[PDB]
Design a protein around this ligand. Sequence first.
Ligand code: NA
Ligand code: NA
Lengths: 296, 294
Amino acid sequence: HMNPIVVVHGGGAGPISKDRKERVHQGMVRAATVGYGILREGGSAVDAVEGAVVALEDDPEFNAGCGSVLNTNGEVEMDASIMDGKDLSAGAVSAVQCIANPIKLARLVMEKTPHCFLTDQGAAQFAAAMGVPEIPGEKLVTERNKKRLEKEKLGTVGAVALDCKGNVAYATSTGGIVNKMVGRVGDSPCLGAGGYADNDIGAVSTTGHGESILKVNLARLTLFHIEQGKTVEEAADLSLGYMKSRVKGLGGLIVVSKTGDWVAKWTSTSMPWAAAKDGKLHFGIDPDDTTITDLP
Amino acid sequence: HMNPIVVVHGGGAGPISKDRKERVHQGMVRAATVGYGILREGGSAVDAVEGAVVALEDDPEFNAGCGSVLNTNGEVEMDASIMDGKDLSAGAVSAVQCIANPIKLARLVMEKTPHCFLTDQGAAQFAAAMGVPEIPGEKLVTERNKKRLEKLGTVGAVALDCKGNVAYATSTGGIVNKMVGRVGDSPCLGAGGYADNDIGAVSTTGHGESILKVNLARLTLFHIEQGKTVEEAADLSLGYMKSRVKGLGGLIVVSKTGDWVAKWTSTSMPWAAAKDGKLHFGIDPDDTTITDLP
Ligand code: NA
Ligand code: NA
């Protein structure tokens, strides 16, 4: 059976301050830790990617769940998707509000509906009827994002996991872009763009310019290069190089193939990433700054 | 310059009676004529597919705009997306309500926002700012759709323009008795459609859950990239949706060179194509009729 790997990413971003850097690290370490803990228990790659992304929605330092950036009405409006590489099973939610973990609802969508995608009000109603709690507004908005919205008037989190059966999965979550139009949907809930998972190829989770990821369908394009016999690095190189020259978009991504190979590449300035494989934790934000430590 | 082309499709769905096929035929013809008239009058590929889809939305017979199917709540909710293959610019709406033409709303997202994809309450609010009328929701509700709910498919258009640009537009009401705010493939780029001047353009129809799963539109084009012809590539992607996800449906594709095809694993798929002063139509596998264009 395969050696389990979890890969986690923060938002593709510009320069990070020496400070966010500290809490970002531990945020990335915490999520990669849960994702892996899940696979050591023999959990599925779906359970692990879900697990990792929940940690990031709950961690205020990351643009998803609590800590999401604000829309043009100052409100939190969130998107998420998860994909099961076994039979291509998927669930996704767009434009959701007043809920803690949009990724759990995407999972509920995949696992307890005949659908793959619920939006806005019907997304709230499905959460209401599945007994997801409504949160007393306020809670989701952080003082850092409050200033951020006044200023203009951070990025998508994801996870890719490979389990002992060779199953792969991805999960993505985001509150979008600051001052975005109400009801704007980025790449996250769109399968092929914000992510793709296929036991025959691998799984990808992306970040960066949402519309640009959509226009190029980045996650599925990365995988297309792999199917053609490229390495995980060359595929990510090539698919991001394309998003750069064709539509002028920047981002980043995390991929893992069906054979245990993984990398994290980006064209934005920063992308906090973490990976757990064989009880070693890898972490980085800028290229080269990579640390490797034990993971008991 | 290229000889321009438009292809249209109705839904990749089940059997259609003799009595109503003549009527779907009237619809397809009107839509293709509308697309090809824009193309022959110096209009863009994007112009041409919006014009063709707008027409099927306006026709209460097809599951887009007027005549959408009703969700679980006896309500109409519409998905749409349109794409320009030159710069890969795109527009898309999901779960839009009380407006006549979702594809027209889709193009305004493309042109008028720094976004590509709006949904539900935000799109409705955008529609208003764009002066798009808020029209009786029950005027989108036909008697038949109130009935069929109690007891057809996604439409679309591809085109290649004289300048050599490709575009797709796709609009749906979705599937009968869907959950509130269920989004299919139709506003998801690469599933609902894809257009890229450097390959061609595809529009898809059928069970939307399956189409999202396999990235059907971009896959078809992946095969076209590999040297597979349009029919070949269409057969592989549609074949793979059926094998891998047990999903049925159809698609239309126009390549950069101007080769095109209509293909479906579903029973029926209304379709009409226009090029070289001729109209091509069909609903059933192997029943094509080639007439002269007016
Ligand atoms: Na968060
Ligand atoms: Na219609």
